[PDB]
Every structure is written in structure tokens, then in C-alpha cells.
RNA sequence: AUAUUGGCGAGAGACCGAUAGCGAACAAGUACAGUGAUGGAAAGAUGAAAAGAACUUUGAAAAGAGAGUGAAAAAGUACGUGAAAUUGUUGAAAGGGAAGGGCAUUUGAUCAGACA
RNA sequence: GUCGAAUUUGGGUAUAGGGGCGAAAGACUAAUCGAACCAUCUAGUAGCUGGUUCCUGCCGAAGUUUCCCUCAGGAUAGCAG
RNA sequence: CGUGGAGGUCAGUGACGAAGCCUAGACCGUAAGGUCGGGUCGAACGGCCUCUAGUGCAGAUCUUGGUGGUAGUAGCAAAUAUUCAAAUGAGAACUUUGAAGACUGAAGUGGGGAAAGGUUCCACGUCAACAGCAGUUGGACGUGGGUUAGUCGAUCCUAAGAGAUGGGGAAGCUCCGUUUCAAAGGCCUGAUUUUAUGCAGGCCACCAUCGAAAGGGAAUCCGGUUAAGAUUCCGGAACCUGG
RNA sequence: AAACUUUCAACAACGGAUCUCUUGGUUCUCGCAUCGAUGAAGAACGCAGCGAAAUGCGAUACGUAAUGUGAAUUGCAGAAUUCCGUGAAUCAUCGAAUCUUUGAACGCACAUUGCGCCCCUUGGUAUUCCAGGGGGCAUGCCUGUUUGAGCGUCAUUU
């Protein structure tokens, strides 16, 4: 159980922290797990989602599908994969808000900073 | 777009004054075009640029004044440390440890000593 | 407004509240290059000030009106 | 009162510019609690008391 | 203690044909004219507001407090009262259950649980982990949310890493001979927990 | 000019929703005005000092 | 006569807008605001006003200055500026 | 060492659970009332997700009626569950200045248990 | 009824609560006047009126003594559990 | 017996449907109440040995909220009064135009302002609500546009009064008083032709400020113009003040 | 015999109880010392590509700089090179600035967007009139400076 006196077990405060988090605090909340493919590759488990990652849906009605994130939507705690969508009655298509804890990242989008991210965390990266 | 702040610092005082008369004519153009069309989102960065030039103009002069009051008493009140009014009364560290020469001897003669209890 | 510009040779501006008829007559000459007979002002009941600037007969407000992009 | 002081007239103009309903696009926003304009004032209902 | 009294409410008296409790004065709002200050009124104070000088703790004679924890210790023998709490003891070799002291030096949670099972307490280790249910009250948003049963209690004379080893494994608690809480020897005031005595704790208990 | 109807277009609203949307605002006010007049008529006619023109 | 016919003669404002609290408590003939107290140096309040304090105390406005003092305290009332690291 | 119903930052409970808990869980000292000092509320909840009803027809329209979305419209922005007063429809019975109750059995409707 | 004067009335102004003002009626002082209005002391005090929330079993009264500025109330004894 | 929470236990029940609600359906109990069936419903909850309390309602001219009977009833009756046709519209006793008939009768039911309101003015669209009938009309609803000054007002002056200063009381909030027991101030130019203003004689003693859109007061008229502004805008003809 | 009244169940109404929730309250414990003439607390008026209010801000107006993180904001439009980068963002952090008219509020007033004066600079054929621009002009008290007042007072002298 908890030891430190600086951290809270209060359910009211946890749910207050979560729903009130600013954007830069939510980026860490939206971490998604890497595949059995990549975690032997990059030696790392999860990463904060980014807009261009390629991803596979491992839970829900959309299970088994895959695509590339269109927009990471941080008000809704949602990520929008294109190739996962639902069509309205009048033909306009609408995206399916997914929660990245239910996804798996197949291919990363690497920058200097993203390379630096995997640096700190114990990776190797080719 | 918008100006970058660190690229302006290199510019001289009187270039920026010319830079800023250009950005002002821009709005007088972009506020005429904003009543001919429904929306004109471009007008945001041009008036947040005028604030990025005025920040550097004013930043230069204030550290041109820090240099001509440098290293001497009585500099204008808005260049002084701010702190808080209770902490600007606040006898300075030099007027704190001020001690009469009587105790100054007493301190030196009998200061507090370190010791321990074993054997 | 535009019916005076194209008729009575009068430019109609939204001018700042702090400005008086001396500062207006001076900044019309400076920005738009013109010469002014007369300035009349009123504070609109949204809380802003309107100016009726009547250029001299040496000019045509219609000629300058469309130079800054409205007409 | 047909011949006015500027501090009054400046307060008539602030109440003229709050006199409009909600803009519609506000309702469409995520987590919107707001429904209608609850502070609408009317010269036939509540006098603003200067 | 200011709750409900923040109002200025006078009784309207009589003769206006409504009950005589104090009515909020004023107008134009719709709070105005409604009863106040009573315990029978909406928004008024309660009957007998609770107050913090209610006696909370309780003194118990230190000799009687000791009288109880020497019954709760004599009650962890006598197998029949252990079964009456649960505590599947059917498989255990005998009771009291005295383990070699080396259990006090075990450094790891993985190594500790392997020891309790090897002793034969696994039956009661499973009684927990099967029993976790939500709380049936409003105490679920008061941070009491999850409930469960109480596995064995381990008693050690000297601590080396054994308290942190077993602290994660659910429902299982550890105490020193020198302490022996009653709250941990008779939960709910029901005697006879199943206690695991280390050797050095079972001599020092004398 | 831009005929503020057109502003509503660009803003992400339709000249259709502007009816369906505003008529839900037009009526939802009444449920304030119907909840005020209902609770109101109970205690409003209570009057502090009333002379009772004659009683005998 | 003391009722609805007399309520018709009532058009002249006794009070006008106050500059300090802007509440229209300002009395025209006494030249005094009956809420803040202007033009008195001190701000009118009373310990029997327990609500009417809670209305106007500090924290019910913008706090254009005090807002930042607790932040500015924990740092030590620093001056100068931060330097840099990387990335 | 002591005091602290303010301030800042934290952790907690055998506390209240939207008529309760602060007056205020919501754009609450807010809307509103008064000349003023002052007085001062009401107001939480679709769904996992708007996927918030395209398309057809009658009607001037609101909507209706079908199809459609959804695990469910017995969730349609009057939206979780949806009680009681009270009401409309259908069915049953009753009725000579009230109605309603107790004991008793007949008549009508219903109910098991049991046997076998 | 009175209607050229002890007239009628607008605005400015002065007088504020045991105070003001009154050609006087205890009149008027923001529908409040034999002491205004608003908040606190205040959940003022009441020997006086009203109310006091589930079952069932066993037992079961008193309106009388003495004293009290005591007589719409208490102490005391008696009856009762 | 029942209710809201706490400790224990039944390795209790539950999206294969918890809780709740409706149920002249069944069972147990002397009773408070408990157990089951069916219907609606959707995420939590009980039995028992114990702990604790903001723990049980039919009334209090009880609090809050909702709703009845009365009842399609009381009434929607002052200010003389309307009618035909056409146009619009889905719809006309009520909107619009014409035609009639009337009325206020200039101490007006007209043409303008003061206090007060604050956008009610004007245009276009729209008719859910409001207009105690109706409504295509609206002082409503949604969107817009509109108030132009050297001369008109304020601004200035003082009235009745208010109110700093100097002082004087008062534990103090503040009170007295308004030129008062006050060292209360800046002018007119001569002296200067190093330079501008030293030094010069004389003076003048009223010595804050506030206080009137009806009192005092520098000066503007005619004609035309707008959907809505004009002694302000236009054209013309004047005038005042400071320099 | 219908209507009608009344009782009950069904489905549907009017109404919002009940149950289940909870980014709020409430009480107790722990740590901390931090408002303002260097203009506070409060007030008014303004600021958005489309905002009425709430939160944010001040004509640099939902923010400017700086710093960290490292690719959004999102109702729609938009921006895209700003995407292996001195760099997205209603982001955190915040040390440098801005800070309208006011307010202890200070040139004097203030029911007025009234009325001054002084110094520097600018225009109009102007040291004096008018305009524009920048910096000023409160009271009490303290230490010092300079200029003074008084047969209060000591000398100097002629």
C-alpha cells in the first residue's frame, strides 16, 4: 500500500485531478502500449501517443482493425484512428473515439525528441 | 507567421521603430478587409507581433538605463528590487549583526563551545 | 455612411474615444495625405466614437475611399 | 433622461451590448452545461436601476 | 455552527393566518416569506446540531485491557474457536502453529507467500482474494470502497525484512510479540484468529 | 456586407439548426417563467401591513 | 392617498452611482456613499454585517496583484531570468 | 514551548449525499426585491459513443405515420429509474337522500396445496 | 368647499429615532408611527396555547396533607413501577 | 420488528439482471413486519454475531414542493361606434388601402420639452411565448442601422447651504468653525542692453473649494435634406470671442 | 338499459418521490509566513476570426518576453513550415515587461469624462495666444541643504 504522506488516496481528489488536467498533463495519461513486435525492438513498454503513429485496436467492437491516428483529441481523452469510423444515415462518416489504453502501437513516428524519449527509458533503437 | 523575438534583438533601436510602423499599416489594411468578408483570422498574429516588437523595444531601453545608473546609489524606483513593502523596510543584513563592542568582546571572549558527554 | 462618401465628399471613421477633433484632423492628414475642412464627432450608443471628416474641395473622398480597400 | 451624463450613457451602452441571446455555436461545444442566456434584461421587465 | 442561522427571519406574529414560525422577510426573490431556523423548516438548522466535544475515545483500565489480550492469545490455541471464524485450519499440522524463526529473515514477497503455503496456510490465503466485494453503503465514496476477509497473522520476535515481505500479500498481517494488538487478535470481537508463531516469538511470549 | 446570417454559417451553424436551436432556447425560458409563476403565487400576496378597510 | 396615488409622485433619485464601490449607494445631498463610506478614507464595514463583509472582502474581485504573491513567494522573490538547458 | 472559524499548501474521517451538506455541487452573493442600509433563491443525471432521426408521404406548420440509429427510444436534447396525490381510455361490478367498516354465508373471479 | 391670497406647485436646501416637524389630530417622518426602518446581541424569556413518529406482553394511578407574593405553578407526604 | 453507517463472518447474491418501483397473485407472523411469483428496470446488494445514531409520523392555523374539488363556473359590461369592399394569407369582427359613419373640439385623444426610462426610435425578416378574445399586426421575437454644433445646453458665477486649511475638542470613529487669535500671495513694470530678469519704488489684502441643464450669462438665421438625425448635415446670409 | 358516481387492475398522462451515482460541502490533523505611496483590496469600462455570462487580461488587452516539455487547439473555420525543430499548445513554469479611467488616491475638483500651473520637445509667418508629444505639481513628519525673520541675543566696529 501507500507509504509517502505527500500522495493522496482520496477518491474525490483523484477524479478531480483527472478531469481537470491541462493538456500537457493529459499527454502522459494517453500513453498506449507497444506491440510484442516493437517492445523487443525498442526495449520499452508504453509511449505517449502521437498523431502519426500506426496502431491496432485490441478491444471492443472495432477489435482487429488498424490504421493511423488522425487527431489525438485531448479534451475527450480520445484518439481518432482513420480506418476506424462509422457512417451516419445521410452518408457523412464520423470517427470513432478510441481510448489509447485499448490500442497497440505497431509503428512509431520518430523525431529527435521522440528518439530522445526512448533514450531516457532504457531503449536501444537500431 | 509572426516575428520571432530573438531575431529582433539583433536589430538596432531605430530599425525596430521602422519595423513597427510597418506592422501598424498592416492592421489598417487588415481591419478594412475584416468588414468585407465574414472572417479574417490572419489579423491575430499581426497584432500579437506588434506586442513582440514593443516588448523588445522597451526591453532595450530599460537595460540601457540599468547601465547609466549602474554601480551607484539612487536608481529609479521601478528599476529597484520589488520584493514586498514589508521586506524593503527590513533592516539589511549589515544592520542586523551590528553589535556593541562590549558584546563583540563578550562574544569573542566567551562564545558557545562544542562538547560531548562520554568519558 | 457610404452614401455620403459617394455624394457629400465625407469620410466616416471609427475613431478612438480619447481622440479630439484636433488629433483627428491631424492624423487624417498624416495617414491618408488629405486636407480637411471640418470634423464632426459623436459617440455611438455602443460606446464608440464616430467621426465625419469632410475633405476639402481639392479632393474626392470617393477617390481615396477605395484606395484603402473599402467602397 | 434626454440630456445625459457620460458615465450614465457609458452604462446604457454596456447594457445594450449584453442584450443579445447566446450565439448558437456555444451549445455545440464539448461539456457544455449552458443552455440559454439567463441574464437577458428587458426594458419591459426589470429596470436596471441605472 | 453558523449553519441555518445566517438568515434574518422574524416571526410574522399572528393574525395573518399562517403558522407563527419565523419567516424570511424581504421580497422579490422567492426565498422571502419561507420558514426558517427550525428543525422543521427547509434550510433551517437541525435539531441539536452535532458538536465536536462529543466523547470520542474511551478509557479502559490498563489491567483490563491486558485482561482481554491474554484471552485473545489463549484463544488462538483451541482449534474449535479458530474454525468458528473461518480460518480453514483443517489441513494444518497442529495448533498453535510454530514455524522456525528463519521466516523472520525472508526478504521477498514471492519467497514469503511460498513459505506460508508450505506451512499449510494457503487455504486461508485463498479465502481472501476470493472475497473482495464492493461495500454496500455510501461508504464506497468515503474511501472504504473494497472489503475482504482476514488471513493469518504472523508473530515475530525480531524483524528482519519480514514485515515488508508480507505487507503486500492481501489480508495477511504481522505483529511483534512486544505489541500484540487486540484489534488484530479478535476482529469484530470474535476470538480465535489463526496465528503463525515464529520460534523466537513463541519463547519470548513467556 | 456579410449579412450576419452568413456569419452563423462560417461559425459552424446552419440556417436550419438556427431555427431548431433557437426554438429550444425560446421555449426553455418558459420553464423558468412557468416555474417562477407557480411557486410565486403562493407567498406573494402576503403583505406586511394591510389595513383591512373594514371589519365588523 | 398614502398608497398607489402617492407612489406616482416618486421620480427624484436620492442616490446616484458611487465611484469607489460603484453600487449606487452614493447619497446626493449628504455627499456620502452609504455602502463603502466614500469619501471616507476607511471602507465602511461592521461586525454586525457578517454577510455584507463576505460580499466585498478580498477574493471577490480580480486580485490583480495578490493573485501572484504566493507564487512569487515560494521562489524567493527572484530577479533576473532563467538560463537554459537543452531540447 | 503557547494561540488561530483568516491566508497559502497538503493529508484524512463510523461526517452530509442535491428539501441533506456552506446561502451557493450548476454563468451563487448569481437572477430578483428596496430610496438605502440590507435582503437573496431556484437550478445535478440520454448513451459506451450524437450514432440528436437521412429518406417517403398527409398537413401552412408543430408534429404525426412508416423506415432508420442503438444493447434499449418501455433512453428522442420535455431525455437514468419515474412513486403518490390527480387524470384520460378500456374492461369488470355497484347504485331509492352520502360513502366507507365488523361478524356470517350465498353468488360471481381467482389461488395454490394436495393427492395420487 | 374654496378659488388672488395665512394660495397652488417644480427643483435646490436644512432638520434623523426617545430625534425631527406639528395653524395640535399623538398628526406626519417612503402602504410602517402611543417611539420608524435594517443587522447583530437572539435559538431573548414564557408557571401560558399547539405538536411530540413502531408493535406487543406484564403492572397500573391522581385530582388529597403540609409550606410558599402560594390560587392556570412548585417543594413535601400519599397512591404507583 | 424496522432505518442510515462501522467491525467481523457466510471464499453470500448479481448485466444468465443488484437496488428501487407497480402487483382485489401466494406464503409465514398475535403484531410491528418478513419471504416468493409476474410486470417495469438497469449496477450495485444483502443474511446473521456485534458497534454506533441527524433512526420510524396522520395532525404542529407545521416547512418545501406538487396537485385537486369549486368550474368550463365568477366574470372578460366606464371612456357614445362601427360597417362594406378589395389586397395579403393556410387562416381576417381585429392586419393594409379605399369608401363611408363617427369621436377628441383646440384647458385636445393634437404639435413639443423637464424629471424618469434606455434603444422602446427605424428597417427588414419571423408568429413558440406575450399582447387576460384573435392576430398575417406589435412598444413582442431574431438581425441590423441610427443621435454630427465656436453660437442650443452643460462647462463659468453666485443664492439658500455644504466644506477643507490654520487652529480648537475628542480614549477614538470624528466634531466645531469658514476667515476664523495665521509669518496664509503674485502682480505692475522701472532698473539690463555682459543676459536675461537681478536688484528696484510702489503697490492690492477681497486670503480654498463646492453649490442652479427654471436664476445671472459672449455670439445663428432662412431654405433644402433622411427608412430613422438637424437652430448640428447641405447651400447660402451673418455674428461672437481669443490671437 | 345507457349516461353518471364510486372501487380495482391495465396501458398511457400530470408530477418529480424512490433507488443508484457525485470535479461540492463539512469537520479534524500537519506544514508555512507572504498586502499596499515601487500605488494594494475593491470598482467602472473595455479586450476574441465568430462570446452574452463565468474564468483570463489591459489600447503589448482570453495575453508580450523568458524558461521547461516536445506536436496540437477542436464547436466550426483556420494556420500550416511551426513539424529529425530556437518549435505546436485555452499546455505547464514564470525571474523580464505591459498595466485604460479610478480607488488609501496625491495638481484642484468630481451628480462634470470639468479646470489649471510648471519644465523639455514640435507644428502653425509666435518668450506672451492655440494645438500635438513626453516628464511633473498631495498632506503630516524626520535628517540634511539653501534662503531668510525677530533690539530674542552676544560681539564688531566707525
Curated annotation (Swiss-Prot), chain A:
CDD domains: KOW_RPL26 (cd06089)
GO MF terms, alphabetically ordered: RNA binding; structural constituent of ribosome
Gene Ontology cellular-component annotations: cytosol; cytosolic large ribosomal subunit
Keywords, comma-separated and alphabetical: Cytoplasm, Ribonucleoprotein, Ribosomal protein
Subcellular location as annotated: Cytoplasm
Family annotation (Gene3D superfamilies): 2.30.30.30
Entry keyword annotation includes Ribosomal protein: yes
UniProt key word Ribonucleoprotein: yes
Pfam families for the chain: KOW, Ribosomal_L26
Signal peptide per UniProt: none
Family, per entry: Belongs to the universal ribosomal protein uL24 family.
Note, other: There are 2 genes for uL24 in yeast.
Quaternary structure, from the entry: Component of the large ribosomal subunit (LSU). Mature yeast ribosomes consist of a small (40S) and a large (60S) subunit. The 40S small subunit contains 1 molecule of ribosomal RNA (18S rRNA) and 33 different proteins (encoded by 57 genes). The large 60S subunit contains 3 rRNA molecules (25S, 5.8S and 5S rRNA) and 46 different proteins (encoded by 81 genes).
UniProt protein name: Large ribosomal subunit protein uL24A
Species the sequence originates in: Saccharomyces cerevisiae (strain ATCC 204508 / S288c)
Source taxonomy: Eukaryota, Fungi, Dikarya, Ascomycota, Saccharomycotina
Curated annotation (Swiss-Prot), chain B:
GO cellular component terms, A-Z: cytosol; cytosolic large ribosomal subunit; preribosome, large subunit precursor
Gene3D superfamilies: 1.10.287.310, 6.10.250.3450
Protein's name according to its UniProt entry: Large ribosomal subunit protein uL29A
Functional description taken from the UniProt entry: Component of the ribosome, a large ribonucleoprotein complex responsible for the synthesis of proteins in the cell. The small ribosomal subunit (SSU) binds messenger RNAs (mRNAs) and translates the encoded message by selecting cognate aminoacyl-transfer RNA (tRNA) molecules. The large subunit (LSU) contains the ribosomal catalytic site termed the peptidyl transferase center (PTC), which catalyzes the formation of peptide bonds, thereby polymerizing the amino acids delivered by tRNAs into a polypeptide chain.
Keyword Ribonucleoprotein: yes
Compartments (UniProt record): Cytoplasm
Matches recorded under CDD domains: Ribosomal_L29_HIP
Gene name for this UniProt entry: RPL35A
Location (main, coarse): cytoplasm
Domain of life where this protein originates: Eukaryota
UniProtKB keywords: Cytoplasm, Phosphoprotein, Ribonucleoprotein, Ribosomal protein
Organism: Saccharomyces cerevisiae (strain ATCC 204508 / S288c) (Baker's yeast)
GO MF annotations, alphabetized: mRNA binding; structural constituent of ribosome
GO biological process, one term: maturation of LSU-rRNA from tricistronic rRNA transcript (SSU-rRNA, 5.8S rRNA, LSU-rRNA)
Family in the record: Belongs to the universal ribosomal protein uL29 family.
Further comment found in the protein's record: There are 2 genes for uL29 in yeast.
HAMAP family reported for this sequence: Ribosomal_uL29
NCBIfam families the record matches: L29 (TIGR00012)
Pfam families per the UniProt record, alphabetical: Ribosomal_L29
Residue positions where Phosphoserine is found in the record: 12, 49
Residue runs in coiled coils: none
Curated annotation (Swiss-Prot), chain F:
Cellular compartment(s): Cytoplasm
Family stated for the protein in its record: Belongs to the REI1 family.
Functional summary from the UniProt entry: Pre-60S-associated cytoplasmic factor involved in the cytoplasmic maturation of the 60S subunit. May act redundantly with REI1 to directly promote a stabilizing structural rearrangement in cytoplasmic 60S subunit maturation independent on the REI1-specific ARX1 recycling.
Misc. remarks from the entry: Present with 2240 molecules/cell in log phase SD medium.
Subunit structure, as described in the record: Associates with nascent pre-60S particles that have not yet entered the translating pool, and is released from mature 60S subunits. Interacts with pre-60S factors NMD3, LSG1, and TIF6.
Name of the protein this chain belongs to: Cytoplasmic 60S subunit biogenesis factor REH1
Organism: Saccharomyces cerevisiae (strain ATCC 204508 / S288c)
Name of encoding gene: REH1
Full-protein residues shown: 377 to 432 of 432
Curated annotation (Swiss-Prot), chain G:
GO CC list: cytosol; cytosolic large ribosomal subunit; preribosome, large subunit precursor
Pfam families in the record: Ribosomal_L37e
Cofactor note: Binds 1 zinc ion per subunit.
InterPro entries according to UniProt: Ribosomal_eL37, Ribosomal_eL37/eL43, Ribosomal_eL37_CS, Ribosomal_zn-bd
Residues engaged in binding Zn(2+): 18, 21, 33, 36
Entry keywords, A to Z: Cytoplasm, Metal-binding, Ribonucleoprotein, Ribosomal protein, RNA-binding, rRNA-binding, Zinc, Zinc-finger
Molecular function terms from GO: RNA binding; rRNA binding; structural constituent of ribosome; zinc ion binding
ZnF region ranges: C4-type: 18-36
Superkingdom per UniProt: Eukaryota
A biological process from GO: cleavage in ITS2 between 5.8S rRNA and LSU-rRNA of tricistronic rRNA transcript (SSU-rRNA, 5.8S rRNA, LSU-rRNA)
Subcellular location, record wording: Cytoplasm
Cofactor dependence: Zn(2+)
Family the UniProt entry places it in: Belongs to the eukaryotic ribosomal protein eL37 family.
Function comment: Component of the ribosome, a large ribonucleoprotein complex responsible for the synthesis of proteins in the cell. The small ribosomal subunit (SSU) binds messenger RNAs (mRNAs) and translates the encoded message by selecting cognate aminoacyl-transfer RNA (tRNA) molecules. The large subunit (LSU) contains the ribosomal catalytic site termed the peptidyl transferase center (PTC), which catalyzes the formation of peptide bonds, thereby polymerizing the amino acids delivered by tRNAs into a polypeptide chain.
Comment field (misc): Present with 21800 molecules/cell in log phase SD medium.
NCBIfam families attached to this UniProt entry: PRK04179.1 (NF003214)
Name this protein carries in UniProt: Large ribosomal subunit protein eL37A
Gene: RPL37A
Amino acid at each position: 500500500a501507500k507509504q509517502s504522506l505527500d500522495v493522496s488516496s482520496d477518491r474525490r481528489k483523484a477524479r478531480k485531478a483527472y478531469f481537470t488536467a491541462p493538456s500537457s498533463q493529459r499527454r502522459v495519461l494517453l500513453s498506449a502500449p507497444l506491440s510484442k513486435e516493437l517492445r523487443a525492438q525498442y526495449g520499452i513498454k508504453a509511449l505517449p501517443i502521437r498523431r502519426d503513429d500506426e496502431v491496432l485496436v485490441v478491444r471492443g467492437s472495432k477489435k482487429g482493425q488498424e490504421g493511423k491516428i488522425s487527431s489525438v483529441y485531448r479534451l475527450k481523452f480520445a484518439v481518432q484512428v482513420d480506418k476506424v469510423t462509422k457512417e451516419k444515415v445521410n452518408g457523412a462518416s464520423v470517427p470513432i473515439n478510441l481510448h489509447p489504453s485499448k490500442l497497440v502501437i505497431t509503428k512509431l513516428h520518430l523525431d529527435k525528441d521522440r528518439k530522445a524519449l526512448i533514450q531516457r527509458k532504457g531503449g536501444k533503437l537500431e | 507567421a509572426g516575428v520571432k523575438a530573438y531575431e529582433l534583438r539583433t536589430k538596432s533601436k531605430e530599425q525596430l521603430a521602422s519595423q513597427l510602423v510597418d506592422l501598424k499599416k498592416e492592421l489598417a489594411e487588415l481591419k478594412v478587409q475584416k468588414l468585407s468578408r465574414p472572417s479574417l483570422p490572419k489579423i491575430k498574429t499581426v497584432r500579437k507581433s506588434i506586442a513582440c516588437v514593443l516588448t523588445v523595444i522597451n526591453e532595450q531601453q530599460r537595460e540601457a538605463v540599468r547601465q547609466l545608473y549602474k554601480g551607484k546609489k539612487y536608481q529609479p524606483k521601478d528599476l529597484r528590487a520589488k520584493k514586498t513593502r514589508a521586506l524593503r523596510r527590513a533592516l539589511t543584513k549589515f544592520e542586523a549583526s551590528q553589535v556593541t563592542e562590549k558584546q563583540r568582546k563578550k562574544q569573542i571572549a566567551f562564545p558557545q563551545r562544542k562538547y560531548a558527554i562520554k568519558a | 455612411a457610404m452614401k455620403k462618401v459617394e455624394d457629400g465628399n465625407i469620410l466616416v471613421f471609427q475613431v478612438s474615444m480619447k481622440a479630439n477633433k484636433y488629433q483627428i484632423k491631424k492624423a487624417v492628414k498624416e495617414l491618408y495625405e488629405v486636407d480637411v475642412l471640418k470634423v464632426n464627432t459623436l459617440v455611438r450608443p455602443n460606446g464608440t466614437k464616430k467621426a465625419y471628416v469632410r475633405l476639402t474641395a481639392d479632393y474626392d473622398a470617393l477617390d481615396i475611399a477605395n484606395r484603402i480597400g473599402y467602397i | 433622461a434626454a440630456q445625459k451624463s457620460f458615465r450614465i450613457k457609458q452604462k446604457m451602452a454596456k447594457a445594450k451590448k449584453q442584450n443579445r441571446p447566446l450565439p448558437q455555436w456555444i451549445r455545440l461545444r464539448t461539456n457544455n452545461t449552458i443552455r440559454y442566456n439567463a441574464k437577458r434584461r428587458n426594458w419591459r421587465r426589470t429596470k436596471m436601476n441605472i | 455552527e453558523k449553519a441555518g442561522h445566517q438568515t434574518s427571519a422574524e416571526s410574522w406574529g399572528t393574525g395573518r393566518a399562517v403558522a407563527r414560525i419565523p419567516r424570511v422577510g424581504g421580497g422579490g426573490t422567492g426565498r422571502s416569506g419561507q420558514g426558517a431556523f427550525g428543525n422543521m423548516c427547509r434550510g433551517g438548522r437541525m435539531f441539536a446540531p452535532t458538536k465536536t466535544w462529543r466523547k470520542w475515545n474511551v478509557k479502559v483500565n490498563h489491567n483490563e485491557k491486558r485482561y482481554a489480550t491474554a484471552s485473545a492469545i489463549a484463544a488462538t490455541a483451541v482449534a474449535s474457536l479458530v474454525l468458528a471464524r473461518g480460518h480453514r485450519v483443517e489441513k494444518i499440522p497442529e495448533i498453535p502453529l510454530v514455524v522456525s524463526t528463519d521466516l523472520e529473515s525472508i526478504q521477498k514477497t514471492k519467497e514469503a507467500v511460498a513459505a506460508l503455503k508450505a506451512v499449510g496456510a494457503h487455504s486461508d490465503l485463498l479465502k481472501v482474494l476470493k472475497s473482495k466485494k464492493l461495500r454496500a453503503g455510501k461508504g464506497k465514496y468515503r474511501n472504504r470502497r473494497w472489503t475482504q476477509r482476514r488471513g493469518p497473522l504472523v508473530v515475530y520476535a525480531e524483524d528482519n525484512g519480514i514485515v515488508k515481505a508480507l505487507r503486500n500479500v492481501p489480508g495477511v498481517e504481522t505483529a511483534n510479540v512486544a505489541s500484540l494488538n487486540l484489534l488484530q487478535l479478535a476482529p469484530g470481537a470474535h476470538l480465535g484468529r489463526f496465528v503463525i508463531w515464529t520460534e523466537a516469538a513463541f519463547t519470548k511470549l513467556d | 456586407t456579410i449579412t450576419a446570417a452568413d456569419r452563423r454559417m462560417v461559425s459552424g451553424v446552419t440556417e436550419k439548426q438556427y431555427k431548431k436551436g433557437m426554438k429550444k432556447m425560446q421555449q426553455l425560458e418558459k420553464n423558468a417563467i412557468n416555474t417562477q409563476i407557480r411557486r410565486e403565487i403562493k407567498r406573494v400576496n402576503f403583505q406586511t401591513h394591510y389595513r383591512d378597510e373594514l371589519l365588523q | 392617498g398614502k398608497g398607489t396615488p402617492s407612489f406616482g409622485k416618486r421620480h427624484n433619485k436620492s442616490h446616484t452611482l458611487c465611484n469607489r464601490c460603484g453600487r449606487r449607494s452614493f447619497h446626493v445631498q449628504k455627499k456620502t456613499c452609504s455602502s463603502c463610506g466614500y469619501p471616507a478614507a476607511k471602507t465602511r464595514s461592521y461586525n454586525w454585517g457578517a454577510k455584507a463583509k463576505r460580499r466585498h472582502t478580498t477574493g471577490t474581485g480580480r486580485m490583480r496583484y495578490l493573485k501572484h504573491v504566493s507564487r512569487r513567494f515560494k521562489n524567493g522573490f527572484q530577479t533576473g531570468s532563467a538560463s537554459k538547458a537543452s531540447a
